[PDB]
């Protein structure tokens, strides 16, 4: 693997061979065109799961949801040439993406009608039926989270790469709680590290110890980060990790910051977050023992737009911990208002 690089601080240009990890999170777009195994092997596996009491699908990531949306039309074109009364209905994802107990089966044989090669030029749009196979949406009443498959796809051996436009997926035969290793890239060079995949970009630095520097998440997965793809996994207390392990945070010494524990009650309902270490605009933080204890994260603006300007903490270090979502700036679990009653603030209502 060949390439050339430029460093803009220590002005320098270089070329050679090596291993390169790219930032595909910022400016994520339609870089990949996803397809399942075969048009008739997915239809057979979906049909069998419906006859085994599985209602629908809960999506592991944004990537799987986009793949389900594109394939949905062709999938319903099959399943009618076989007389099956079943319709796949794809909705949108809500953070966090909660787990599911079931998995999709591997059909013993494909459905005996249809075509190969995902992406037929023209087919007749199928008609609606009475039976729905819902992929993650706002449909938790017609079938609950306890009858939903989750994490049943695996990226194929040569299905991914740097110069790849189409990614090949496949229904797995085993049962797992791990995040897919084919799309994870971790690298350290000198005093900077990164743990990254298609939805996370988590950076670290070395000041006196290794600490978290900033993170940018465009989804909240709930799989487990594999240890083969993690740096410095030993001697780790699970209660010191800033990004909780139940939210696919790496089990690393790089996932720590001095004076902060795990943020199980951060604003994990947002569609996109940025974890930053500095004050929010207009507010200041002091350290004093008269402050309160940890609770849910609080927004720095009230529900009517007023800004609370003075905050405190007990034994936290500066700069403070902040979450920057589209609705606003939020403080860490350890940082509480100094004068304003907490009943007048917007609080986080989710827990990892």
């Amino acid at each position: 693997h060949h390439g050339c690089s430029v460093d803009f601080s220590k002005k320098e240009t270089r070329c050679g061979t090596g291993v390169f990890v790219y930032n595909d999170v910022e400016a994520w777009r339609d870089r990949y065109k996803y397809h399942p195994d075969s048009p008739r092997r997915l239809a057979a596996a979906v049909k069998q799961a419906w006859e085994d009491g599985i209602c629908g699908i809960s999506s592991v990531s944004r990537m799987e949801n986009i793949m389900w949306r594109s394939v949905e039309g062709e999938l319903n074109a099959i399943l009618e040439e076989n007389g099956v009364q079943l319709t796949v209905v794809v909705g949108s994802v809500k953070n966090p993406m909660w787990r599911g107990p079931q998995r999709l089966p591997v059909p013993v044989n494909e459905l005996p009608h249809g075509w190969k090669a995902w992406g037929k030029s023209y087919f007749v749009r199928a008609a609606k039926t009475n039976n729905s196979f819902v992929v993650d949406g706002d449909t938790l009443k017609e079938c609950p989270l306890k009858h939903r498959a989750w994490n049943s796809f695996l990226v194929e051996d040569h299905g991914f790469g740097v110069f790849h436009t189409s990614v090949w997926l496949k229904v797995r035969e085993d049962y797992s709680l791990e995040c897919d290793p084919a799309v994870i890239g971790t690298a350290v060079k000198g005093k900077e590290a990164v743990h990254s995949d298609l939805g996370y970009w988590i950076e670290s630095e070395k000041n006196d110890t290794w600490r978290l520097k900033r993170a940018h998440l465009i989804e909240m997965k709930t799989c487990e980060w594999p240890k083969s793809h993690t740096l410095w996994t030993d001697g780790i207390e699970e209660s010191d990790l800033i990004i909780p392990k139940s939210l696919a945070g790496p089990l690393s010494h790089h996932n720590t910051r001095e004076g902060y524990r795990t943020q199980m009650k951060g604003p994990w309902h947002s569609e996109e977050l940025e974890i930053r270490f500095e004050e929010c605009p207009g507010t200041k933080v002091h350290v004093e023992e008269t402050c309160g204890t940890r609770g849910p994260s609080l927004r720095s603006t009230t529900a009517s737009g007023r800004v609370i300007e003075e905050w405190c903490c007990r034994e936290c270090t500066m700069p403070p911990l902040s979450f920057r979502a589209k609705d606003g700036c939020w403080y860490g679990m350890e940082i509480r208002p100094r004068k304003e009653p907490e009943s007048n603030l917007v609080r986080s209502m989710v827990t990892a």
């Epitope: 008269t290 309160g292 204890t293 208002p337 100094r338 009653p341 907490e342 007048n344 209502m349």
Partner: antibody, heavy 117, light 104 residues
Framework: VQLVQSGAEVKKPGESLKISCKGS????????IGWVRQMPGKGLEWMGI????????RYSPSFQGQVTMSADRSISTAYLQWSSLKASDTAMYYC???????????WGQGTLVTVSS | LTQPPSVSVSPGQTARITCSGD??????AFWYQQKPGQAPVLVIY???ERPSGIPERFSGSSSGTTVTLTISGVQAEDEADYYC?????????????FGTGTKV
Amino acid sequence: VQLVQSGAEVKKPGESLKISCKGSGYSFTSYWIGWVRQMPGKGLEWMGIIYPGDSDTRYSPSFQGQVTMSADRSISTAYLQWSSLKASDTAMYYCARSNVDGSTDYWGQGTLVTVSS
Amino acid sequence: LTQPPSVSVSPGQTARITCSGDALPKQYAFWYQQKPGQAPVLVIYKDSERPSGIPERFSGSSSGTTVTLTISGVQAEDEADYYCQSADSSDTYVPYVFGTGTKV
């Protein structure tokens, strides 16, 4: 920590009255101070809170104007003033130390106010 | 906001007191005990926890828009009134509100 209130008062209608609540043992200006009423044989009600240091007051809608809360951060004392006591003001009045998260930690022994004629 | 006006049990039994309100899902709740002649005492804070100095037979739980105070091993020294405190957001008024009471 300690909050000490004034003595019992026996009053006639139509004059003013100041009751006090002195506190000691902690940073008096780092916490709110709440006032709670309890009529004879009834339940508790909130009369509002005052933040000493900068005398920010947040009354209850059923009490604004009819009572005035004040603070004096020099002597660590918070007050409560009437102008014309009525016959429906017979109750026990508690001062308390409120936290930012909402829990009421310490309560004063209470001041029994009687208005008769 | 709402409480049952009176309950009655026998020694050794376990009594349950109910507090109901709309804003309870997004707000904390506190429980106060007041024996006749004295000032209120905090027994349960933040819907589940106990301050140091309270017998371990006091507990509370939250289930949706309702919070319950349960007294497991009732002795004689529990004949008091129990008050529920919650909050509702504002900008110029006091956020806090007391429950009506329960004469156990």
